[PDB]
Design a protein around this ligand. Sequence first.
Ligand SMILES: [Cl-]
Ligand SMILES: [Cl-]
Ligand SMILES: [Cl-]
Length: 129
Amino acid sequence: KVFGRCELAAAMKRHGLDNYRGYSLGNWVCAAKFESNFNTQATNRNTDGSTDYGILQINSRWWCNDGRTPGSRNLCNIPCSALLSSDITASVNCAKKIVSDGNGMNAWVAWRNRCKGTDVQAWIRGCRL
Ligand SMILES: [Cl-]
Ligand SMILES: [Cl-]
Ligand SMILES: [Cl-]
């Protein structure tokens, strides 16, 4: 599913992501924009052989099981395929664990490089929330 911008903001809020660990909704929408362009089915293969999955490009090295990332963990206790669903529940619940892991949203390199320090509220501007 490719979400609309406000549609995704609303779904993220529904699932308790808004201001989670102090990160406003615009941060999460911005991260999703640059990680996946709002596409739940996004996948990307990393140089180390791990894969990033879903709207927030969650990585199989630590967070989910895909059966093909040697030496990896599955800390969200989910198959990586669950992160590709039209229902963002699994991605949100896993993101909550990731952002609580110590480095906040810096876990998402694209958030650090493209969202951090910017006017992230622009991502939810106009949205009925
Ligand atoms: Cl915001
Ligand atoms: Cl594996
Ligand atoms: Cl980047």
